[PDB]
């Protein structure tokens, strides 16, 4: 997973900008952890939004 890959990451965030559970998306636990890191890094750089 990559923090720069906004297209893929946007599939695993909601409209509000919240990370979706692995039970919903069917992601494996290892990748779900990488995904969560990537999204938070993207949030820091203002590539993704935190809220709203």
């Amino acid at each position: 997973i990559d923090y720069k890959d906004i297209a893929t990451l946007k599939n695993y965030i909601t409209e509000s900008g919240k990370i979706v559970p692995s039970r919903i998306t069917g992601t494996r636990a290892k990748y779900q952890r990488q995904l969560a890191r990537a999204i938070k890094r993207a949030r820091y750089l203002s590539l993704l939004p935190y809220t709203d």
Binding site: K4, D5, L45
Partner: protein, 100 residues
């Protein structure tokens, strides 16, 4: 030891970015700098406002360097009042391939 440096510049200061990108790479290539990737992403739309700015000039650099010179580069970004944000990361390997 394989870093990845993103930094975002004040969008009005997109003209300064030419001179700064030189200085950073010149310092890194001074001491066994391996500029694996360098991508001027350009003035992108921010997902939220940073300092009442809705745009900023993004830059990416994947470099191998001394762990001292990167800390010395991080010191400059703080002092650079134009540059608004930066994430220095550690990569395990070199990244040569292009990002979107």
């Amino acid at each position: 030891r394989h870093y990845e440096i993103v930094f975002m510049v004040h969008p009005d200061q997109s003209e300064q970015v030419p001179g700064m990108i030189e200085r950073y790479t010149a310092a890194i290539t001074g001491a066994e700098g391996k500029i694996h990737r360098l991508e001027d992403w350009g003035r992108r739309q921010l997902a939220y406002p940073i300092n009442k700015l809705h745009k900023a000039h993004y830059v990416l650099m994947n470099v191998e360097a001394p762990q001292e010179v990167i800390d010395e580069l991080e010191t400059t970004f703080r002092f650079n009042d134009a540059v608004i944000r930066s994430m220095v990361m550690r990569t395990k390997h070199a990244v040569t391939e292009a990002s979107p």
